[PDB]
Design a protein around this ligand. Structure first.
Ligand code: MPG
Ligand code: MPG
Ligand code: MPG
Ligand code: MPG
Ligand code: MPG
Ligand code: MPG
Ligand code: MPG
Ligand code: MPG
Ligand code: MPG
Ligand code: MPG
Ligand code: MPG
Ligand code: MPG
Ligand code: MPG
Ligand code: MPG
Ligand code: MPG
Ligand code: MPG
Ligand code: MPG
Ligand code: LDA
Ligand code: LDA
Ligand code: LDA
Ligand code: LDA
Ligand code: LDA
Ligand code: LDA
Ligand code: LDA
Ligand code: LDA
Ligand code: LDA
Ligand code: LDA
Ligand code: LDA
Ligand code: LDA
Ligand code: LDA
Ligand code: MG
Ligand code: MG
Lengths: 280, 280
């Protein structure tokens, strides 16, 4: 049972779930301006944990055949957990996630249901179909914050965080698909760069540009102050500059550098929302 | 320069420093009962970060020759950083750590100075001399909490956390040395299980038993309540049981299992201290 617990924790990818759950607490902290309720905190942390755990289990279930060749040591291809045990377990995690969100509010239930639908469909077919898949990665990463946000008293700045995360991550996913063009083509993967070439980079630029337009809104709405504004101004210029560089040099090496750079900026933007929330 | 920064962050082991710094904030949170001051919490986080970073750099400096064999991708054996650049850098980190602790209080300066002395001497000679080295690992792990504790208003429960951490980790280090006897002997390493045989396990038991005796004190002193007590009672019985098992079967396989088990219990004890404090 010490080794069986190790296997179940490996199937749900417990560190990935904890990371997503901290994301949900971050959304809750911003929304409540650090005026944190412990019952509400536990509900946010565990709804995110269970829905994320469900997403990881449903991913392994659909990937059992692929993993038999690629990652044979995973819980399902190795035979340490039976397919039918994993399917029963995925149902439990989902029910716990959905039932716990009923104790937050209707907005939390809607997010939980939408996430569950996206997670199943991503695992089932959209992981390989990048035009829809890129959007799902963006939506799911951002929704984790929104989940904590709807539990708090002031969700508006978290709505902006969610929207900026969705758009910029969706944009960055396209940049990554441009970098991985050769390997994806010889793998039966469909993506915007494979289907449209360098034109896809204009759509990635558009998504980064909408995210930049929304970014000063918490300051404009008088929710956050000067520190948020200064950090967001630096990050907004760096986002535009990074995409202008990719558009001037549309190649694999540049897409790789821009992808790494956008990841760093996104983390500084997350810090800016936290710093803006530190208004106590 | 992003690659040179990457090399410096690898040299200080930035994730290890962040972990130790969170340890310091945990000590501060317990001591102040979550009534956290932002200037005090930045001082605690950064003094711990800089002293920890210094410890990691001084370790790599003394290990430059050994690392050419044991870990050759590290910044100093690989040549990415020169020895003299690392020595200058270690001096900066130390000065920043010591100077920042002056802005906390005299207790923080004393801990910072003691830690710096232990870190240098551990890297210089005591890492290989396990009778003293085991104690240094125990003291340094526990001191991180004590560092945050002395910044807060109620250090007493953190003194107990520090003392229990020191004793149990020192005890666990001996169990680990018993498991690694063969490999240590053929490497010119001196340790209590090499010097004395199974008798060293009585000294490891003594340290654990002493940690167990101190553990109910935050409840006895009326600092923490029922939840702390229940968790500590379970953990105390498991600690005694684990050592009794090792004393009945003093072999490599049992020492290995007991070492892993003690690590889990120590983390539940940390949770008990957090929970005790969370009862504001
Ligand atoms: C009240 C206290 C009760 C606690 C009971 C004790 C249980 C703790 C024991 C578990 C330790 C073993 C961890 C298993 C590793 C799986 C990580 C899986 O790794 C990951 O997350 C992926 O690498 C992410 O991609
Ligand atoms: C901070 C991190 C906190 C960690 C908390 C993690 C909690 C783990 C989740 C518990 C939900 C209940 C599921 C129980 C397992 C049942 C086996 C399911 O398997 C089956 O259905 C098969 O038939 C196996 O026999
Ligand atoms: C054997 C497998 C182990 C499975 C363990 C499952 C863990 C479930 C964890 C959920 C978090 C509990 C938080 C408290 C809920 C309060 C709702 C009460 O509601 C209220 O009164 C108001 O909504 C408060 O805002
Ligand atoms: C095949 C399995 C079929 C599914 C079975 C599900 C398990 C049983 C659960 C049923 C839902 C009942 C919970 C409703 C209480 C909501 C409290 C309302 O709480 C709130 O919203 C607070 O007041 C805070 O807003
Ligand atoms: C009129 C039906 C609309 C149909 C659905 C269209 C989907 C498109 C919506 C996208 C925007 C998502 C953010 C809104 C969350 C606000 C929750 C609100 O949360 C709250 O009110 C908090 O509890 C308080 O802070
Ligand atoms: C001013 C413009 C707006 C700024 C927008 C910044 C967003 C704020 C914070 C977002 C959270 C950080 C996520 C880290 C990036 C990795 C995405 C996770 O996806 C991935 O990389 C994986 O492939 C997942 O499968
Ligand atoms: C409440 C007030 C609202 C404040 C909001 C923040 C303002 C920042 C907005 C971003 C503007 C777009 C970035 C400029 C283009 C960068 C390429 C510039 O091109 C270049 O790199 C040159 O060639 C220099 O080498
Ligand atoms: C407010 C402005 C923000 C500042 C902008 C600076 C950008 C940050 C860039 C980070 C580059 C990542 C390299 C880190 C690798 C070293 C890990 C080495 O650590 C480890 O792997 C462990 O410690 C060992 O267990
Ligand atoms: C005034 C409070 C300041 C904080 C004090 C310094 C941090 C001590 C906390 C960490 C516990 C580990 C102790 C082992 C010695 C570290 C050097 C050896 O380092 C290493 O190379 C590692 O083994 C790598 O994992
Ligand atoms: C081989 C090396 C030998 C090592 C010997 C150690 C060096 C001893 C030197 C003395 C410096 C002590 C400074 C104390 C001044 C008070 C700080 C200011 O105090 C404060 O932070 C607050 O005011 C008190 O709460
Ligand atoms: C190999 C090493 C073994 C590791 C040992 C495992 C430790 C045992 C952990 C399980 C206890 C879980 C308690 C629930 C708190 C987690 C969310 C915290 O809840 C929240 O969201 C907060 O209340 C927010 O402030
Ligand atoms: C095993 C026993 C259970 C212990 C679990 C308790 C969780 C820790 C609780 C303490 C509060 C955390 C405050 C630290 C914030 C700084 C991280 C910010 O770090 C940074 O700045 C980094 O760049 C992040 O990547
Ligand atoms: C209502 C709030 C619920 C919480 C939201 C759950 C979604 C998890 C959050 C992170 C999104 C980033 C990863 C993209 C999802 C891919 C499925 C995950 O599968 C995978 O790709 C691998 O198994 C792990 O890399
Ligand atoms: C108070 C002062 C604030 C005012 C500053 C305004 C800055 C707002 C930010 C965005 C401007 C940058 C546009 C870059 C996209 C151009 C590609 C567009 O080209 C394309 O991709 C087309 O397909 C070409 O036909
Ligand atoms: C409050 C939020 C505001 C929402 C505004 C909605 C904007 C309308 C949505 C569609 C934008 C299409 C992306 C354009 C970039 C692709 C290159 C240019 O594309 C084209 O024109 C050709 O297809 C060639 O690529
Ligand atoms: C087919 C129809 C589709 C309609 C689509 C509509 C798109 C809306 C576009 C986005 C702009 C919204 C910004 C609102 C902030 C106004 C300042 C408000 O003033 C302030 O800053 C106050 O102090 C805060 O209340
Ligand atoms: C009554 C007793 C109370 C105990 C309370 C202790 C709280 C402090 C918690 C942290 C434990 C960390 C142990 C550090 C030693 C290094 C072992 C790590 O080395 C390892 O074993 C390797 O990582 C294996 O891969
Ligand atoms: C792989 C070994 C796992 C050992 C875990 C020991 C659990 C300690 C007990 C903590 C008290 C809470 N509870 C209800 C789980 O007993
Ligand atoms: C093992 C825990 C480490 C987590 C530390 C990272 C905290 C930032 C939270 C980011 C939100 C998570 N995400 C990308 C899934 O949305
Ligand atoms: C009333 C409590 C509800 C929790 C029990 C969940 C039932 C799970 C059993 C169905 C198996 C799932 N499936 C269809 C994927 O194999
Ligand atoms: C038990 C909670 C009641 C909430 C009702 C909503 C349930 C909808 C089911 C969505 C789950 C997603 N799916 C079917 C892909 O697993
Ligand atoms: C594209 C649609 C965007 C959704 C806009 C709705 C904003 C959410 C409502 C904000 C509520 C304000 N408050 C008080 C919670 O901060
Ligand atoms: C990384 C950005 C750092 C700035 C964060 C400061 C937030 C605290 C609010 C402003 C400080 C001014 N005050 C209130 C002390 O007079
Ligand atoms: C890089 C982020 C890692 C987060 C890990 C959080 C664990 C906190 C435990 C504090 C104890 C650290 N230690 C052993 C060095 O004293
Ligand atoms: C409960 C929260 C504890 C507060 C700890 C304060 C240390 C924050 C460490 C991040 C350093 C980055 N910076 C300078 C932008 O704040
Ligand atoms: C005010 C002192 C703060 C920084 C500490 C500097 C000490 C490091 C030693 C550098 C030695 C310089 N040099 C080129 C002669 O080796
Ligand atoms: C900030 C000045 C006052 C504090 C006293 C300074 C003592 C420094 C001695 C500790 C460091 C010695 N070393 C290099 C062996 O680690
Ligand atoms: C047995 C090791 C000795 C460690 C005890 C630490 C000294 C007490 C701390 C001083 C009190 C600090 N403060 C701010 C709470 O008054
Ligand atoms: C082995 C010696 C034990 C260390 C001595 C005890 C230190 C006491 C610290 C004072 C505590 C002050 N208080 C109650 C406000 O936290
Ligand atoms: C270091 C803190 C010292 C003050 C703690 C108070 C002493 C405990 C009082 C004993 C009362 C006994 N009892 C169980 C009947 O309440
Ligand atoms: Mg699988
Ligand atoms: Mg080295």
């Amino acid at each position: 049972f010490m080794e069986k617990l190790k296997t179940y924790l490996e199937l749900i990818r417990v560190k990935n779930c904890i990371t997503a759950s901290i994301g949900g607490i971050i959304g809750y902290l911003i929304s409540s301006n650090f005026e944190i309720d412990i019952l509400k905190s536990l509900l946010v942390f565990f709804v995110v944990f269970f829905v994320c755990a469900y997403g990881n289990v449903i991913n392994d279930i659909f990937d059992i055949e692929i993993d038999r060749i690629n990652k044979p040591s995973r819980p399902l291809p190795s035979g340490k957990i039976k397919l039918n045990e994993a399917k029963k377990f995925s149902a439990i995690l989902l029910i716990l996630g959905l039932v716990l969100s009923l104790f937050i509010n209707i907005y939390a239930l809607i997010i939980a249901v939408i996430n569950a639908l996206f997670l199943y469909l991503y695992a089932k077919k959209y992981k390989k179909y990048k035009p829809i898949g890129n959007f799902i990665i963006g939506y799911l990463t951002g929704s984790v914050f929104l989940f904590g946000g709807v539990a708090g008293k002031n969700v508006m700045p978290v709505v902006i965080l969610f929207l900026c995360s969705l758009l910029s991550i969706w944009g960055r996913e396209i940049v990554k698909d441009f970098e991985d063009m050769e390997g994806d083509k010889k793998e039966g993967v469909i993506s915007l760069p494979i289907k449209y070439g360098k034109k896809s980079l204009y759509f990635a630029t558009f998504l980064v540009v909408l995210a930049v337009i929304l970014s000063p809104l918490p300051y404009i709405l008088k929710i956050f102050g000067i520190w948020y504004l200064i950090l967001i101004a630096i990050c907004d210029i760096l986002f535009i500059y990074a995409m202008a560089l990719l558009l001037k040099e549309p190649n694999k090496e540049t897409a790789s550098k821009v992808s790494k750079f956008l990841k760093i900026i996104m983390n500084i933007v997350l810090l800016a929302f936290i710093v803006g929330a530190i208004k106590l």
